[PDB]
C-alpha cells in the first residue's frame, strides 16, 4: 500500500479489457471499475457514460454522488 | 350539485414550522405553496409527503381541494408540518361534512400507522446556559 499511479487515459491493453467483460458482471460503478482496471476514475465515469451511449450497459441510479450500472438482462 | 361553503382550515406544527391546509370541496388535488405535492425541494421526503395519500387512497382525496401554506421552520420540519396538516385537515373535513364513522375508520389507520400524523410533537428547543456552548454541554475545564 504505497501508491496507485492510476492511468488517466486508456491504452490498447485496457480498452478491450474494459469493453469485453465490464458489461458482464452484476455491479458496475466508477469506483469498482477504477479499482479493477487500475484507472483514475474520471476516466471510469467517462468510459461508463460512453458505454451508456453505446447502449450495452443499463443505468439504474444516476445520483450525483453514487451512480450504479448493470449488465443487460440475459434470456 | 353546487353546494357551497364546504371548507376547513387546519394547521400542523413541527419545530415552530406551521402549515395550514385549506381543505375544500372540489376535484381531488393537493398543492403546497402553489406547487404540486409530489414536487418539493427535499425530494428524499417525497414519501413522507405522500404518506397520508398512500395510506388512505386517492378515492378519499378525490373530492377535496387542498392548499397548504408553510411560513416557518426548516426543510424536514416543513415536510412533517405539511403531512400532519394534510392528515388533520382531512380528518376535520370528514368529521364535519360526513359521518364520524368514516372519520374514525380513517383516524385509526392514521393513528396505528403514525401518531405524529395527528398529534403535534411538543419538543421544540432548550435555552442555552452561560456555562457552555449549548443547552447542556459545558465548556472544557482544566485543573493545571
Amino acid at each position: 500500500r504505497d501508491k496507485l499511479n492510476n492511468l488517466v487515459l486508456f491504452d490498447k491493453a485496457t480498452y478491450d479489457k474494459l469493453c469485453k467483460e465490464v458489461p458482464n458482471y452484476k455491479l458496475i460503478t466508477p469506483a469498482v471499475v477504477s479499482e479493477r482496471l487500475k484507472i483514475r476514475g474520471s476516466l471510469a465515469r467517462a468510459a461508463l457514460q460512453e458505454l451508456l451511449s453505446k447502449g450495452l450497459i443499463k443505468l439504474v441510479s444516476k445520483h450525483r454522488a453514487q451512480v450504479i450500472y448493470t449488465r443487460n438482462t440475459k434470456g | 350539485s353546487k353546494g357551497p361553503l364546504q371548507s376547513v382550515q387546519v394547521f400542523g406544527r413541527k419545530k415552530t414550522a406551521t402549515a395550514v391546509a385549506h381543505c375544500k370541496r372540489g376535484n381531488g388535488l393537493i398543492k403546497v405553496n402553489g406547487r404540486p405535492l409530489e414536487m418539493i425541494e427535499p425530494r428524499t421526503l417525497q414519501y413522507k409527503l405522500l404518506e397520508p395519500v398512500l395510506l388512505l387512497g386517492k378515492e378519499r382525496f378525490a373530492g377535496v381541494d387542498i392548499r397548504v401554506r408553510v411560513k416557518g421552520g426548516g426543510h424536514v420540519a416543513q415536510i412533517y408540518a405539511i403531512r400532519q396538516s394534510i392528515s388533520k385537515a382531512l380528518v376535520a373535513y370528514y368529521q364535519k361534512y360526513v359521518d364520524e364513522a368514516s372519520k374514525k375508520e380513517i383516524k385509526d389507520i392514521l393513528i396505528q400507522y403514525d401518531r405524529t400524523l395527528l398529534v403535534a410533537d411538543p419538543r421544540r428547543c432548550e435555552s442555552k446556559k452561560f456555562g457552555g456552548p449549548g443547552a447542556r454541554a459545558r465548556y472544557q475545564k482544566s485543573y493545571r
Binding site: - | 402553489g34 406547487r35 404540486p36 414536487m39
Partner: protein
C-alpha cells in the same frame, strides 16, 4: 391543461430557459464574463462558459416568484458561505455588478421593467415566455 412554472421542477426548467436564451441570443453580455468571480466568497470562476444565460434565467425565475427585487436583493439570493480560511465561516452576498448587469440585460430583452417603487418585475410578455417554456419542459418531461 395549462402549465405554469410552479408545476415544473425549477432545475431543468431554468436549464431549458437558459438554453432558449442562448439559442435566441440577443443579450447584452458584458466583456468581463470570462474573468470575474460570481461572488466575493467564491474562489474560482464558474465552470460553465455561458453561465451568464443561466444566471439571467434564474433571476427571471426569481422575479416571477416574487417581484420588486433589486440588485441587493438578488445578491441576497445569490449569497453563499464564505469559508474565511482559518477563521470561522460566515455569509457573503453576490456580485452587485453581476446582478445589475443581468437585470439591465433583462430590460434590454424588455421582459423586465422597473416598478413604480424600487426594484423591477416581469412584464406580461415575459410572464408569457416563462409560462410557454414551463409548458414545453413539462411536455418534454412527461413524454
Amino acid at each position: 391543461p395549462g402549465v405554469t412554472v410552479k408545476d415544473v421542477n425549477q432545475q431543468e426548467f431554468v436549464r431549458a430557459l437558459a438554453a432558449f436564451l442562448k439559442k435566441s441570443g440577443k443579450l447584452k453580455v458584458p466583456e468581463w464574463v470570462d474573468t470575474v468571480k460570481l461572488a466575493k466568497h467564491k474562489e474560482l470562476a464558474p465552470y460553465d462558459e455561458n453561465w451568464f444565460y443561466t444566471r439571467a434565467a434564474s433571476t427571471a425565475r426569481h422575479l416571477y416568484l416574487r417581484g420588486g427585487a433589486g440588485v441587493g436583493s438578488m445578491t441576497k439570493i445569490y449569497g453563499g458561505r464564505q469559508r474565511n480560511g482559518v477563521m470561522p465561516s460566515h455569509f457573503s452576498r453576490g456580485s452587485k455588478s453581476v446582478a445589475r448587469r443581468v437585470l439591465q440585460a433583462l430590460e434590454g430583452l424588455k421582459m423586465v421593467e422597473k416598478d413604480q417603487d424600487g426594484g423591477r418585475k416581469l412584464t406580461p410578455q415575459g410572464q408569457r415566455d416563462l409560462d410557454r417554456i414551463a409548458g414545453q419542459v413539462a411536455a418534454a418531461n412527461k413524454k
